[PDB]
Structure 1
Amino acid sequence: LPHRRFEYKYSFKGPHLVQSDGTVPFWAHAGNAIPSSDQIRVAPSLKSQRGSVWTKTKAAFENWEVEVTFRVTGRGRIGADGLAIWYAENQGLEGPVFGSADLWNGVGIFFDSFDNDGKKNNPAIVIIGNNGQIHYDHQNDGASQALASCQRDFRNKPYPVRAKITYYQNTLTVMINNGFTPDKNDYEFCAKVENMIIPAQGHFGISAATGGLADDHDVLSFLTFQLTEP
C-alpha cells in the first residue's frame, strides 16, 4: 500500500465548507454551483444547469488519490445528466461536458445518469482520457471514447456515494462505495486504465449539469492525497 499524505490545499469538507465571503477556501466555484456549509450543490434539479468547482492552484503530484463523497438525487427512476470528476491541465469552467469545457488535457471520470444512446446501459461510470484533441460525444454517453467504464447506480442511495480514484504508477483505478450502508469503507471495483499518461501539473475539478431532466448533484467532500511508493 502506498502511503497517503493529506493535502488540505486541494480539499474541501464540512461542517463549515462555505466561508462568509461565500468562498470555499482553495477552490473556485462557477456557474450554477451553490456552496453551503455541509456541501456544494454543483447543479440544482432545474432544467439546463451547469456548475463547477476547481482548485485555485495547480498540483504536481506524481501519484495521487482523490476521495469524493456525493449524492445524486432525483424524484424519478430517471435523472440527468450526471457528474464529472476532473484532473486536467487547466481549470475548465464552462462546457457541454457535464458543465465543463470540451477538449480537455487530462482525464475525466464521468458519472453519467442519463441514457442518451438508449443502449439501456445507464447509470454508468466512464473514464475518458484526453490530450486536447477529442470532442466528447454526449449523444452517445461517450461510449466510443471510454478507456474503461462500469455500470453503477449512484442515484438515490440511502447513504452518500463515494468514489476513490487513484493514480499510482501510471495506473488509474476507480473504486466505488455504493451508498447501501453506513460503512464508509465499503468500496467495490469499478474500473482501471493501465499505462496512462496525464499532465505533470494540473487542476483537480468537479462539474455537474442538467438538461431536460434534472437531479440535484451534491458534493459533500473532496479530499486529495499525494501518494508515495514506500
Structure 2
Amino acid sequence: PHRRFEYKYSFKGPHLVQSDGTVPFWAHAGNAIPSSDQIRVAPSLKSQRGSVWTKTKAAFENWEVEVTFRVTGRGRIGADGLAIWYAENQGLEGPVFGSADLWNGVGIFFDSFDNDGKKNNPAIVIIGNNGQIHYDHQNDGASQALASCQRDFRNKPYPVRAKITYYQNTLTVMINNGFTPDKNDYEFCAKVENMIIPAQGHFGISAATGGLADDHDVLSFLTFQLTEPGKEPPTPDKEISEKEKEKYQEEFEHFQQELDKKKEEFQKGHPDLQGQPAEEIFESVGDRELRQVFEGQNRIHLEIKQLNRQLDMILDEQRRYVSSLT
C-alpha cells in the first residue's frame, strides 16, 4: 500500500518536549512524566496511572501505528502493562490500564500481570468495544480476547517495537521482540478479521501500576495513513521533471560524503568526546541475582583473610614467647 506519515498524531525524540514541558499535539494526564527523549507513562512507584492522548481526532479508514516502548522491572513480575487505544473520546483517567472503561474503539493491551492465574502472562490482547462492554480486569479479558499472542516484552536489551495496521477492516499486530538493534525486524503476533471501529477517533497510549511496579517508557509513536494504490490519485502534473531530481540527488550524496569526511578528522581531533558501550546496560534478573551473591561472598573472603593474618600474628607472638623462659 501507500503510506503517508501524519505528524499531528506522532511524537519522537530527541526533542520530544518543548520549553513549556508538554508534548506538541498531545495531551498527557495522570502520572505521565514526559522527557526530552521518552515519555514515562507510569513510573516504578505504587499505584501510578498515566495516559497520553491526541488533541485532534484522526479521520482515517486505513492506518498504521508504530510504537516503540520499554517495560522495565526489578523483579520477574510486571505491574499492569501498556495499552494502545484508538477510541472515540479521550478517556484521560480510569482503572483500565490508567484509562477510563467502556470505550468505543480498539485497544491493544500489553498485559504483564496474570490476574486470572493461568500463567499465560505477559500477553498481548486485542479488544474491540462498542462502549457498553466492561473490561474483565480480574481475568485479563480472556472472554473478550479477539486475538492473543503470548510474548515477553519486559527487560529486553533493546526497545520493543510494535506495528498495528488497520487495512481493509483487518487489524494486524506485528511485534519486534526487542532482541536485535535492527528496526525492520518485525515478527508477526496476531490478526483480527472483519472488525468494525469508529471512522474518527483519538489515538492514545496509557499505563498503570498495581501491587508490583514497572517503568513504562514510550520512546516514539509514529502514525501512517494507508491508501490503496488504485484509490490514491497519482496526479503527475504537479511534478516538474526528473532532470532536477538527477541534478539534486548526486549533489546531496556528495554533500553527505563531504560532511562525513569533514567530521572524520575532527571526531578524533578533540579528545573531549567519549563513548559508552550499551552491552553492559542489559543484565538479566537471574544474572543480577547471581552477581549479587558473588558480590556478597567478598565480605566472607575479606573476613577470612583478616582472621588468617591475626592467626599468623598470634603464631609469631607464641614463637617469640617460646625462647623467653630458657
TM-score, L = length of structure 2: 0.69
- Greater RCO (CA < 8 Å, at least 6 residues apart): 1
Q: Counterparts of 2:98 and 2:145 in 1: how far apart (Å)?
A: 18
Q: Counterparts of 2:194 and 2:116 in 1: how far apart (Å)?
A: 29
Shift of 1:60: 0.4
Q: Counterparts of 1:20 and 1:211 in 2: how far apart (Å)?
A: 32
Q: Counterparts of 2:189 and 2:91 in 1: how far apart (Å)?
A: 25
Q: Which deviations, in whole Å up to 9, do the C-alpha atoms of 1:48-88 show, x marking residues without a partner? A: 01000001000101100000000000001111110000100
Shift of 1:113: 0.4
Q: Counterparts of 2:139 and 2:110 in 1: how far apart (Å)?
A: 14
Shift of 1:111: 0.2
Q: Which deviations, in whole Å up to 9, do the C-alpha atoms of 1:176-203 show, x marking residues without a partner? A: 0000010111111111110111001000
4+ residue runs over 2 A deviation:
none
Q: Which deviations, in whole Å up to 9, do the C-alpha atoms of 1:23-68 show, x marking residues without a partner? A: 1000000000000000000000111010000010001011000000
Shift of 1:108: 0.3
Shift of 1:6: 0.1
Q: Counterparts of 1:77 and 1:225 in 2: how far apart (Å)?
A: 35
Does residue 21 of structure 2 align to residue 26 of structure 1?
Answer: no
Q: Which deviations, in whole Å up to 9, do the C-alpha atoms of 1:126-162 show, x marking residues without a partner? A: 0000000110011101111111111010000000001
Q: Counterparts of 1:96 and 1:134 in 2: how far apart (Å)?
A: 14
Q: Counterparts of 2:15 and 2:102 in 1: how far apart (Å)?
A: 34
Percent identity of paired positions between Structure 1 and Structure 2:
100
Q: 1:104 maps to what in 2? A: 103
Q: 2:180 maps to what in 1? A: 181
Shift of 1:224: 0.2
Where structure 1 has 5 or more consecutive residues not aligned to the other structure, the ranges are none
Q: Counterparts of 2:92 and 2:56 in 1: how far apart (Å)?
A: 14
Computed over aligned residues only, the root mean square deviation of the Cα atoms, in angstroms, reads 0.5
Shift of 1:95: 1.2
Shift of 1:10: 0.6
Shift of 1:97: 0.6
Q: 2:200 maps to what in 1? A: 201
Shift of 1:18: 1.0
Q: Counterparts of 1:51 and 1:185 in 2: how far apart (Å)?
A: 29
Q: Counterparts of 2:44 and 2:140 in 1: how far apart (Å)?
A: 20
Q: Counterparts of 2:45 and 2:138 in 1: how far apart (Å)?
A: 20
Q: Counterparts of 2:217 and 2:203 in 1: how far apart (Å)?
A: 17
Q: Counterparts of 1:148 and 1:214 in 2: how far apart (Å)?
A: 26
Higher helix share: 2
Q: Counterparts of 1:143 and 1:188 in 2: how far apart (Å)?
A: 23
Q: Counterparts of 2:85 and 2:175 in 1: how far apart (Å)?
A: 16
Higher strand share: 1
Q: Counterparts of 1:218 and 1:96 in 2: how far apart (Å)?
A: 19
Q: Counterparts of 2:184 and 2:151 in 1: how far apart (Å)?
A: 17
Helix, strand or coil at the partner of 2:8:
strand
Where structure 2 has 5 or more consecutive residues not aligned to the other structure, the ranges are 227-326
Q: Counterparts of 1:218 and 1:31 in 2: how far apart (Å)?
A: 14
Q: Counterparts of 1:97 and 1:192 in 2: how far apart (Å)?
A: 23
Q: 2:75 maps to what in 1? A: 76
Q: 1:88 maps to what in 2? A: 87
